[PDB]
Ligand binder design. Structure first.
Ligand SMILES: [Cl-]
Ligand SMILES: [Cl-]
Ligand code: NA
Ligand code: NA
Lengths: 248, 247
């Protein structure tokens, strides 16, 4: 379907193609780099564990992937409230050569009533990134669950300097939801439309992708979603999108 | 045994207590930190994968392990000849908070006749260590095998700024040998006695530790081996040494 095909095409261009598994290997990351060069155009990025960034950058720069960004994760997936540890991991991610770092918000601390440590952790990790590395903040909306907490995590993250707010780690029972997307992009519209949104997990197919893009278009404008403002964090979405486009 | 127990005690004080397994976890690294606080005194260091450095430092600083160093590995275990990758990994190790980085020498390239990349990779990684992180260079002497190659990798590494030269990754068939130790510490005595030596893997027991220390004593002097100049890289030696000390 043309509406569906347009969504599939845009979703691929906005994808953070991800592999974050305990049994990941250089070989598997190399294969992911090749997969990022899709028949429908390059994805926006790949997302991998920090130690695989050097071989991924080497590989992308060998296969025409020079403009595919490398994102990684820190404070992950636990979202513990030790700022020092999150900062060290973020510094290492930057040193490996990450273009983007997706850090996990201390959501358990927020749920216990501590708003300060979330703000300070994001602020400290953004400082470790600098002006030239993107920081995405995973608020784990699927666990926060409560709309007020989702909103508060989003506000704290943006005030602390987040470049993106991201729904989920993909490691818990509930990942990206439309309900969370509504809240988070509303907060973005209220505070700073330069801040991006990243639904991660929970995006089945092109139809689901279209739904998330539809919320963005509605709240922030038809042209708002771009690689600089919107990413799909996905490990098993691309093949379905390619089938929607009748490829692979 | 008196001489044996003295060797065991010293070997513990010089140990880089190591865990480098594909199934390593935060929990296993925390347990290793506690194990480094041995009944015979603290080990010199622990050696773990870079991503575990932050939780290891937090743990050591909680449990009286403040003076136990954290070493890690880069370009590991392959010793590939891509300098850019080895340097990025070394920069990351430093950023994680490593006190020491054990980088693998491009030993296959040397066996193919390329001395240049060995020198250049060690030199670049030493630069990435900055001022506050020392560099150990793993030459994989058990694979180099030939005395000329073991000597050459040692010389190249030291000229390139290595703070230690280290026999092995522990991930190949042959690790530390007494023959390699002889050659490597002879090169140290020739060039710079401030450079350290680290036999890694294949140190069986107190008797074997005593043999390696005996080589150091003969080539460099009775008082030469210290935490700043000698480490045992070991993942399964400590329990044996404690049994020798009857602990
Ligand atoms: Cl990692
Ligand atoms: Cl690692
Ligand atoms: Na982690
Ligand atoms: Na490695």
């Amino acid at each position: 379907m043309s509406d569906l095909k347009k969504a599939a095409q845009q979703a691929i261009s906005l994808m953070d193609l991800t592999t974050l598994n305990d049994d990941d290997t250089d070989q598997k990351v190399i294969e992911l780099c090749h997969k990022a060069k899709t028949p429908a155009g390059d994805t926006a990025a790949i997302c991998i564990y920090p130690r695989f960034i050097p071989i991924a950058r080497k590989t992308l720069n060998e296969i025409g992937g020079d403009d595919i960004k490398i994102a990684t994760v820190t404070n992950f997936p636990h979202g513990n409230d030790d700022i020092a540890i999150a900062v060290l991991e973020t510094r290492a991610a930057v040193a490996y050569g990450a273009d983007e770092v997706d850090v996990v918000f201390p959501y358990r601390a927020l749920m216990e009533g501590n708003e300060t440590v979330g703000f300070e952790l994001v602020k400290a990790c953004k400082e470790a990134c600098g002006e030239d590395t993107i920081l995405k903040v995973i608020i784990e909306s699927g666990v926060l669950a409560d709309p007020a907490l989702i909103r508060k995590a989003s506000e704290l993250s943006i005030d602390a300097g987040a470049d993106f707010i991201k729904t989920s780690t993909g490691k818990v029972a509930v990942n990206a939801t439309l309900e969370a997307a509504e809240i988070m992009m509303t907060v973005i519209s209220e505070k700073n439309p330069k801040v991006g949104f990243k639904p991660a997990g929970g995006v089945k197919d092109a139809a689901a992708a279209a739904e998330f893009l539809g919320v963005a278009a509605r709240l922030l404008g038809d042209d708002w979603a771009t690689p600089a403002t919107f990413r799909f964090g996905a490990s098993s979405l691309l093949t379905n999108l390619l089938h929607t486009l009748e490829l692979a």
